[PDB]
Amino acid sequence: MSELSAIETAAAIAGGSMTALEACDAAIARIEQRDGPINAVVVRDFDRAREAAKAADGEVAAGVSKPLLGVPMTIKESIDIAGLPTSWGFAEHADHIATADSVVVSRLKAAGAVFLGKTNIPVALADWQSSNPNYGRTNNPHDLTRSAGGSSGGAAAALAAGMVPLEYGSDIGGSIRVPAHFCGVWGLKTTFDAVSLEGHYLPRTDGARGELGVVGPMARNPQDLALALDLTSRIALPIARIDTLNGLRILLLTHHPRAAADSAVVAAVEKAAESCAAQGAQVSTSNADLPDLSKLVSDYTRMLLIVLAQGKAPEGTEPVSLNAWYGMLDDQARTIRGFDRLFDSFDAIFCPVLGTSAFPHSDEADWGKRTLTIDGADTPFGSQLAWISMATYCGMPALSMPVGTDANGLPIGLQIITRNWSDHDAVRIGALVADALAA
Known part of the structure; x- marks a missing residue:
């Protein structure tokens, strides 16, 4: 290649x-x-x-x-x-x-x-x-x-x-x-x-x-x-304002209350951040303005099931009401506003894409019957939706870029989340992360 x-x-x-x-x-x-x-x-x-x-x-x-x-x-x-x-x-x-x-x-x-x-x-x-x-x-x-x-x-x-x-x-x-x-x-x-x-x-x-x-x-x-x-893009998007990792404000999330991450995936993400910190980036591990990621996983899941079902319910079960759906969109907008406030203090979020690297082929249709091996133990396969929930629910652009390999040679990816409409910034921070990691 x-x-x-x-x-x-x-x-x-x-x-x-x-x-x-x-x-x-x-x-x-x-x-x-x-x-x-x-x-x-x-x-x-x-x-x-x-x-x-x-x-x-x-x-x-x-x-x-x-x-x-x-x-x-x-x-x-x-x-x-x-x-x-x-x-x-x-x-x-x-x-x-x-x-x-x-x-x-x-x-x-x-x-x-x-x-x-x-x-x-x-x-x-x-x-x-x-x-x-x-x-x-x-x-x-x-x-x-x-x-x-x-x-x-x-x-x-x-x-x-x-x-x-x-x-x-x-x-x-x-x-x-x-x-x-x-x-x-x-x-x-x-x-x-x-x-x-x-x-x-x-x-x-x-x-x-x-x-x-x-x-x-x-x-x-x-x-x-x-x-x-x-x-x-349907119209032209804002150009990247960033042009250096010096002073870049990074929020580093290696833990998620609704999903584990394999030690090797965590290490890969943390090393992406230390490279940046060594180039002058300021990296934080926690912030008060960060939304409830647990609530967010559940609100995203409820909405996702409704969308894929197109609002239909099995029989013996009443469909969600149009009114309640509108209420859910309000909850979504409230969570989005939460991230707008977080991104006043941060240029990007660094976190896993997923808690494992590529897993072995599975013939099991139902995700509740799959496991993922994470540091030697079986964990629930479906839990990993947590890592990708923030940017889909709240609309933010999110890059997946290669940052290492695990011990078995499988690629490991870093997720870079930036603020709504700053997609060119997410791309540019990724290019700069690749430079620092070559360094």
């Missing part, structure tokens, strides 16, 4: 080092040579993408340039591409062919990107694994016996094995940060509502899930993410 970044590829084409057809063909080759044991790129559109790369070469020949002109990428299978299936892993929807490009795909195509195909997902996007009966299971390129993460697991696998330089996923339950963390790549959970969800539709519907969930880019480096964000 020493491969060219997306910005590098475009510049390669813009100076003439290579053609857009050459770059497209190299990515097709990397997928065929590398994807057999990984099974990340489960929907392929190679003939159409080649014709498209030829088109982009005719553009550059005519003087045209665009920030992604000729760069091959793939996208999560749940995001519509005109002419390709969108199934979300349901057997019933394996042959649902999308009729329109999603808005993200439209934007990236308009910047000149070329789509080779789509990457794998769990059934209903409801797992931190990617396995389903239409395409099968994606395996972590760092260790084929372990999960690639989910639900943007294919995207993260494909990035980690260097197939394509850019991807785009979705996150309602960690589904961008968790795969990026398990496979050792960068994933940006964006500020709520900052990127349009048009085309991230439940198959056969033109409805999206209008609370909690976001879409955001995935790459091997922070510069590709920043560019991919600028090209897809």
